[PDB]
Amino acid sequence: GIYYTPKIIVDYIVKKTLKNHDIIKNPYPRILDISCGCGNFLLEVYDILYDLFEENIYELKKKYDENYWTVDNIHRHILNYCIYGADIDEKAISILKDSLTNKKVDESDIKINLFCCDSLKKKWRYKFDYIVGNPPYIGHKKLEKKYKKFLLEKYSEVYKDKADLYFCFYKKIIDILKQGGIGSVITPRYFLESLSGKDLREYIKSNVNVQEIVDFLGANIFKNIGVSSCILTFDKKKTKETYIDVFKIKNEDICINKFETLEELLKSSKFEHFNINQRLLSDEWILVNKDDETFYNKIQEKCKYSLEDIAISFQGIITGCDKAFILSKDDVKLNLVDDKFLKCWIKSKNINKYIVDKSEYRLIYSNDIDNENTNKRILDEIIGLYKTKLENRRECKSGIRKWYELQWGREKLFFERKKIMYPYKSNENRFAIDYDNNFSSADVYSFFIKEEYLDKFSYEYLVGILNSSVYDKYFKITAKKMSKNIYDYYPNKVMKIRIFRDNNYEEIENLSKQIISILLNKSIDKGKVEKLQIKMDNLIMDSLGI
DNA sequence: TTCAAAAAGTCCCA
DNA sequence: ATGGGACTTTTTGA
Ligand SMILES: CC(C)(C)OC(=O)N1CCC(CCCNc2ncnc3c2ncn3[C@@H]2O[C@H](CO)[C@@H](O)[C@H]2O)CC1
Ligand SMILES: [K+]
Numbered sequence A: 001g002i003y004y005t006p007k008i009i010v011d012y013i014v015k016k017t018l019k020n021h022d023i024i025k026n027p028y029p030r031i032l033d034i035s036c037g038c039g040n041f042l043l044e045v046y047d048i049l050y051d052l053f054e055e056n057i058y059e060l061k062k063k064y065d066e067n068y069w070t071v072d073n074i075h076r077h078i079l080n081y082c083i084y085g086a087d088i089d090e091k092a093i094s095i096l097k098d099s100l101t102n103k104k105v106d107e108s109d110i111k112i113n114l115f116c117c118d119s120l121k122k123k124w125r126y127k128f129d130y131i132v133g134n135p136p137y138i139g140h141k142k143l144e145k146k147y148k149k150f151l152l153e154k155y156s157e158v159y160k161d162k163a164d165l166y167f168c169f170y171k172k173i174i175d176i177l178k179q180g181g182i183g184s185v186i187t188p189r190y191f192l193e194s195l196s197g198k199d200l201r202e203y204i205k206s207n208v209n210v211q212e213i214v215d216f217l218g219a220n221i222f223k224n225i226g227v228s229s230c231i232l233t234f235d236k237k238k239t240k241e242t243y244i245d246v247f248k249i250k251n252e253d254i255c256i257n258k259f260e261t262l263e264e265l266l267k268s269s270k271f272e273h274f275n276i277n278q279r280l281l282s283d284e285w286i287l288v289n290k291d292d293e294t295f296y297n298k299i300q301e302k303c304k305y306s307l308e309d310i311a312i313s314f315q316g317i318i319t320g321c322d323k324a325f326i327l328s329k330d331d332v333k334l335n336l337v338d339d340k341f342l343k344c345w346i347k348s349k350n351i352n353k354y355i356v357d358k359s360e361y362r363l364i365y366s367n368d369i370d371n372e373n374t375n376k377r378i379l380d381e382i383i384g385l386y387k388t389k390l391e392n393r394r395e396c397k398s399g400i401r402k403w404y405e406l407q408w409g410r411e412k413l414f415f416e417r418k419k420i421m422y423p424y425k426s427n428e429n430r431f432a433i434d435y436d437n438n439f440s441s442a443d444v445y446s447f448f449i450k451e452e453y454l455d456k457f458s459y460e461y462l463v464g465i466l467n468s469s470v471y472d473k474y475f476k477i478t479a480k481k482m483s484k485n486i487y488d489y490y491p492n493k494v495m496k497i498r499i500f501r502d503n504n505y506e507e508i509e510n511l512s513k514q515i516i517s518i519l520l521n522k523s524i525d526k527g528k529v530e531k532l533q534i535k536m537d538n539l540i541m542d543s544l545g546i
Numbered sequence B: 001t002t003c004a005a006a007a008a009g010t011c012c013c014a
Numbered sequence C: 001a002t003g004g005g006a007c008t009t010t011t012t013g014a
């Protein structure tokens, strides 16, 4: 559970907080890392501080105690008054203690301010000038349940529902940061857009001044780690300034060590830079350049409806054990199952633009099985092969579900109707019309149009605009970026997409029906579909005035 | 009773 | 062996 931050990022974060520190004015800066590990950040802090003191050793000697300020005394002064570290791992602190001690060449047994503790429970006796480092990330599934109760009770300002452990480290860092202090950390990027991060975003915006945000998007910063990273730099300085430097990466395929320093990367064409007024941040942080802000605001103002206004959204089936209930449509065991129980089953990859692939899997809607005596063959030979795992599901342990029932079987009538489906994680907008009463797991989301909006919006019109290049860019402006070429397509953002209705409605709908007709042909003239899409994008851009 | 969010994703291969 | 690409379960708080 120890993750190594790349050196180029560590050096950037330390320089970000210390490069303009006035060591003459304050020769006693407290620099802290509350998840210091073996000292990836703190050992670099020592080097930066040592050069800082040695460069002004004669100025300090003249201004202050001239016997105290010598070069030979810098090592002791840094460890006594400047470097602070905390980490839950006892071995890590022991290694870091040796590394700090070995920075020089017993004399007086210098004390080092290293604490082996839970940084979220430690009674911190004072505040700190500078805080740097890389907190632990633990999501809602992997976090220990007894610990979560403590977080939900004591960190409720930032931690509710499906929040993450690193939310609480943001709160702790902000709380123990001195007035006028500077904090700089690398964390997952997801809180910038996620629904769970709403409270954390409010806490940051209303308690610190966010100096800078470096968004690496889907770039792989930690080798062999499936996480997407950002660097946040904030202060508690009294300033009329309210603008954030945002550095957004332009190419996710880059390797982080192109230059000797990170700031060479940021100033280069590999990144784009723009400013955001912190006072203009709503509960959402829309961090885009001026052209995209103009683009986004044009669509928002022009569109009088949202998907949430006109549609009913729902998540797919959650069986709780797919292997027990999902079978290949050619499996001989389906001869045991009455066709009244079988539903068509698709995965996220089966969703294309405008249409769904033919299903290859079947779902046993086991909720319709009355008792274990009438359909013993289905239970004994198919579902019962996983009875132990099925019995461990939460609702089976409480008795709410029978061991053979689907955990969250939803309502069949919601799936057995004309509806629009889209994958939950995709590189692009892929909204399809489902004609085949397809069921799916939670990797596919569905919606249908409310009865009172059927005379204003058709499914054919909706998939037309939703799959357009305009709406692909439009959705991605606020979408949750997960990994390289993957965005979350979840209702908490998809249903906030705004839609319009104007004079181009009939032609847009007609072009969509032509596309659907071609896509359903045996000899798909796939080429003409692209041309029809280009014409539709022109109509949509004409409609939205972009 | 029953919804929907959550990548220190997961897994495979050249 | 690693790095990159294809693809995505069920646990969980509310
Ligand atoms: C099952 C599993 C997920 C493994 O566990 C848990 O469900 N618990 C773990 C314990 C607590 C969390 C304690 C938080 N308080 C911590 N206080 C100080 N340092 C910490 C803390 N957590 C992690 N570090 C350090 O951060 C670095 C990560 O780079 C490492 O050097 C790591 O040692 C929550 C419950
Ligand atoms: K003096």
Ligand SMILES: [K+]
Pocket (backbone or CB within 6 Å): A217, A218, A219, A220, A221, A226, A227, A228, A229, A482, A483, A484
């Ligand atoms: K990534």
